[PDB]
Amino acid sequence: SITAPEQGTPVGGVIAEPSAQMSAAADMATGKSVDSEWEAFFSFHTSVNWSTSETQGKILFKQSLGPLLNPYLEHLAKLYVAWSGSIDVRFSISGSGVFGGKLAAIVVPPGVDPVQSTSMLQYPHVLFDARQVEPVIFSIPDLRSTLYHLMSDTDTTSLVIMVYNDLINPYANDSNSSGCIVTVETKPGADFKFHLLKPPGSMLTHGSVPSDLIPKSSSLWIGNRHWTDITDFVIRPFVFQANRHFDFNQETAGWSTPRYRPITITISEKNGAKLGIGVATDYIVPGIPDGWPDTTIPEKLTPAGDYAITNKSGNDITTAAGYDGADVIVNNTNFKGMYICGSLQRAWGDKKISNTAFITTATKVDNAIEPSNVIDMTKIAVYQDTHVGKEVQTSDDTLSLLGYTGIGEQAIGSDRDRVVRISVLPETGARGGNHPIFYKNSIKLGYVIRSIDVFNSQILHTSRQLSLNHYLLPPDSFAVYRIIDSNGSWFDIGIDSDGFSFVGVSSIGKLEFPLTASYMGIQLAKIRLASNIR
Amino acid sequence: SITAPEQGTPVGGVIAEPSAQMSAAADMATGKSVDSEWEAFFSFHTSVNWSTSETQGKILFKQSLGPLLNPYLEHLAKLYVAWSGSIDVRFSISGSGVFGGKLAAIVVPPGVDPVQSTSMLQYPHVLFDARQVEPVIFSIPDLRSTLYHLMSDTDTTSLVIMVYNDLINPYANDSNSSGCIVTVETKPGADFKFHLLKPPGSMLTHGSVPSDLIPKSSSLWIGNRHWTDITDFVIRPFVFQANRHFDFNQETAGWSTPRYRPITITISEKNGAKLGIGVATDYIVPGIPDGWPDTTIPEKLTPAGDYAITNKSGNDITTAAGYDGADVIVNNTNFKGMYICGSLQRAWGDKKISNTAFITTATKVDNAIEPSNVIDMTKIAVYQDTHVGKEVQTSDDTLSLLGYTGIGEQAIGSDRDRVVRISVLPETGARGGNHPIFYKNSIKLGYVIRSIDVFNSQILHTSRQLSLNHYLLPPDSFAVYRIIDSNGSWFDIGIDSDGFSFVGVSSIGKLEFPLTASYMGIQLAKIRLASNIR
């Protein structure tokens, strides 16, 4: 009639029933007399070194209250929404007995962000010595303004250790420098309850937690400008892109989408017009084909004929030794800064073999094209030899990004004078000590078999997910993903609300690329991102 | 000296301690009774249709014992090596006192391969009717020879539902099967106990369930054979594909991967050869490129010229009204059943810009080709003019699947004899009362503006996830997903371990395509699925 979450007429196992005489035997083999073991045994969280060079007032440990301080709880929070109560944080240390040095400990209240200075000690502090023997506990209370917390709450109580009085090795010279360590462990406490069970596969209203922007492995990675696989990271102080740069508001200023499909267009050439103006057929913005690239011609030019290079007046390369041995590759070609576009080129009557295309954003001037770094319905440009004879053709077409022809140039995307915004160029400088990065992609070339580099603001999959999946990120904060090469050299990437990646070191160097990417958590953009290199 | 897993001298939160009076107020917000909520209610598991046709001695439901029957446990089984105890599985029949048809319920001991036969009822069977008021329970016990199971064990108790009196309803039809569905829900049971805690790392993370095999919309969908979108579902009692047809064993007969990238090959010529034997530059199988397609030529033919099609076998025609205004179409062309790839067509020292290519598999004999379907490193075929005079060329190339040539044809992937398989062709037939399907996907044609209809066995996104993630399913079941056209109608789809989609209706027809998809559960393979049309 009206049945409840447990109501149901029982019948029992038909041949047997659950024999509780049995299950004790399992409890007899093991020590299983109690559930929720994690409430009664400590757990590693991190460890610290403390040495004589680390002076007074330094902050060693700094962690905020939360479930993440014991990974069991990090695993159970996925079921639930909320949490309330305290945490314990064991401290253990072993010094020689000849050493000295006293070491502090402070719970701070929420809303603050501590500072490596003694003014932090103008506050109730507990000390302990490096001669300490029995470990120490420091129950961290929950000092909150609300009845409970969600999992996306950083404004919490927190803890710090700091070097009250420095370390002393009497036997040591001042040149050589030793140092003990400090091991930290945690435990949930006693008043620590979660709350508000979540029905899977729900979608948390403010948004989910970003942990799928970057695929872990590498082979799943391609850039948001050209389909070729990542190979290396590139630092710049400034970054900028609009074609597929989707922010956490799931929008942009671009025109394109995160799918590298062909590009259907139509084109209405009259007399012998190799070129024309291709018009939109599929899009999200009116008058712009989806997936269209973002790069102008460098300079004005006349699309006329075939490739041309040089070796400074004028010994043209036709091999590798000249090219790789050449000084400059000045590229006298007359269709320089365009893509290559596989070019189906259908129409009624063109019983031909569909010659190949070249494109850019630019205004035509009656035979030629002028650069213009803003797209409209008009800038779309072509050069593909539609086999025209003053017999007006009106060909349908469909293309595919393959390479580039501006040989000798720098890697694409480092010149905002060229890049094709509409009105807004999304952009960041740096933030804190953390610097931006592009992602590199080798792209193909037309005449010389070599390949040039590309710059990418985002992996595609990083942009696909943001077209769809509304996430949380306070704009002052980052989504911290951690990288590990085959060797073990790691560094942390940060990702902003806008979408532009960030990193906390001035260079990388070389590394075994079959690298992976793991999740860490949220971190504040006002802080540097870590790195262990070499 | 020693310190135990809990020992450590306390000092407490120095500014304040945790107040239980606070944490109670959290419980005052919620209705927090006790942790381990999952031991006090039920959870959805699946839902099984039961049409008129299910003659008795035919099974509906079959599930072994284990924690995977309740995801709250599935999330905790990663923390404990071992488990033990019972499990209650609720049942509830749709059709509120309207229908007839008893339905059995058997627990079998471990170590069996049950059979759709009445001999299974030569055993203690419980029956219940389709006029059931209160849902039904059937507490499964844990019968075993060892004290505690592991997570990997399978030799366990298992429940089955089987038919005992075929139903009755005058309110259904032969095509659609709206009506009976048998909801199943679970609950751990009193004696259920995990055992033998483990640290995370290890967190093996296997048990991946089908939930992302299809998106929740159409516009993401694309056939594995060709990049264009879906627009219709097609039935055929047989089914066949090999290029990208992946199974839950994460393998195939397919030389290719699920990525529509281009195809790089280094063709070579001597004097004037248009055609040559393309060779790999990227692959997973030796010799064959990735993304290389599967459709042979129909016949022997000497590719030597341009397009030509003629109506009536007495004419030549180059316009739409003449195209449709046609007795038949003839295709007097020399590259008939071929493709339209882009062909960047590079080389060292070779101007005379890139042209278009045409590719299939075929065996080449000195000026021509013939259809072979058993692809090897020799069967590759091209017809691009790389401008070769009297000398080897060493023409590197890249190619992206972009069209077709065989006008006059009206579908692809329907003649299995022309399909390219390495050695084996995956294939199925009808099952239960369910039948296979294809996913239609329009495609380009070349000289003529029209298109033609492809058959596809798999969405790419389906085939991508199978390439990677070890999804779980028995050999004789589906991973059912639902479909809802935007007229409100719906039908279900099943996915066997092989990857072939399956359906239960006899027809589809036209439908409001802007549709959705969702996951209902697991269903035994040998049963008619559900449906409702118009």
Next chain:
Amino acid sequence: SITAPEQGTPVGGVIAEPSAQMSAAADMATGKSVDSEWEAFFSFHTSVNWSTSETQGKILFKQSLGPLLNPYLEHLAKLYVAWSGSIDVRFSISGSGVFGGKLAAIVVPPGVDPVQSTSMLQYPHVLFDARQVEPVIFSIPDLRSTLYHLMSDTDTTSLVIMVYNDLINPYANDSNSSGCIVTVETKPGADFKFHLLKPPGSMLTHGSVPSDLIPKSSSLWIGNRHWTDITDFVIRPFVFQANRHFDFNQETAGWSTPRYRPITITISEKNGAKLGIGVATDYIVPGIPDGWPDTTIPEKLTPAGDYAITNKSGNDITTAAGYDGADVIVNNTNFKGMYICGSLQRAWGDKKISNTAFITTATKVDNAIEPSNVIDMTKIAVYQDTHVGKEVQTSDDTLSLLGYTGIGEQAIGSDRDRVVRISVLPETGARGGNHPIFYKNSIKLGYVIRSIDVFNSQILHTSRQLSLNHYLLPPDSFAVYRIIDSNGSWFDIGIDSDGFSFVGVSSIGKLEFPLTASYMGIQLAKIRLASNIR
């Protein structure tokens, strides 16, 4: 609503009543026990040998525990999936007074790979001298680690006989062909008890018990290479076959199936070729037909004419019963070695009585052929008088195999290089002092009336069941089937996982062929089998 397993409305005996004064009357005439009577005597089980050639330390009879040791229990165990408890045993010898010699009987615990030596006797050993008239009783307890066992478990306690002192017959030290038969008999202890009804018609997962691999008559036996009936057996050190040879993983290296049906192919030839190449219609492996033979020509040849058989290299063409006088019948023919097949030449314009096949596998270089050690779709041979001319005359042929042509050759199968293998050739040697075998049927010749011998690795019914059904056997074990002639002369066949048979002697002689069979258990591979013959 629900009806439970034992829920109904008892109206009962309408005319009468199931009384109780009567049932006890039947009891007192026949007597009773506690619902069972096979727990009070010693069933007969088997009998084995003990001859002079079995020296000290050697073994005769290892069977593990299980209900197979009592034919009342092997019967019942088809109702249950489980068991637990011991056995009582009685063995004895039917020896003369002169036949001195001593014997042993040990229960070895589980998890042992015992040895045909004497070190086992340091375990508690029972004795039984041949002179000892009266039998002996002892027990076999179920020393196990689990709460119980399953029928698919074969890692239990096990009995072993061992020759504590060898046999002696002081009289006939000429032939050494003595007897001393042993017998074994079983009674279960009251501790014995089954568990866990198996739902009838249900199989097991680990696999069934092999007790239907061989029929119970020679009349139902035929070879896995030719349809003829068995006549006699053969021993060889090396044994091998690939055509219809299946293993207990339901696999094979073959191309064929366990049938003997007409083959159907499709010639396509011209110019009076008479040497076509057959393509496939039905198969399991592509290219190769099903039921196609496993034999290559001896050597190269050129088919034009017809038969020829001559006495020697200096003389006549025997063509009569005066041919045995040759002893070196040399077969100087047009062709040799082929297998004959009937035919049905269906070609649309061949209004003539169709004509015989003369096929094999071989390479067609030219109008001649050459040997094909290996099979492929190009290595299929025919020599028909297919009624053709200049013009192509395609036809279906519908072959069916009858006999053989390689007069004078030895029994087929010996010639390894003539035998066909795709890639792999299953092969064995001696094994634990046993010998492998073939099975000898006959096959018929072309010209003379006579019949040459043929070898076979399996009976056909042994091969149908293994393609289909999932039997159980560990690799270090056999399936012991006892073979009996019309006399009481008998022996035992073991069968490994691969399907190759084995025997524990080096000869058979001849015997009353109306023979039978019976399953007897699971003996190791190390161990010698029985032989009670002459």
Next chain:
Amino acid sequence: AFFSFHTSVNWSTSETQGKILFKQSLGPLLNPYLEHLAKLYVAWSGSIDVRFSISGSGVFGGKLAAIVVPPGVDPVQSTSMLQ
């Protein structure tokens, strides 16, 4: 101590007042367990129980009639047995 499936029938519409739907002399053969054990004996004695279930949950009108005929007779396909 429970019930075991034996067989199944079709009491369709075109069957009338006097047909027989089921007729089996007594023996082990009314239970496929016992039949597997009659191979181990040459005798039996005692009643057997039976159970029916009709599939007309509340719909199908129409009833049946049962008789326990004695040993020696061989019943017929008429109404007279209902005397």
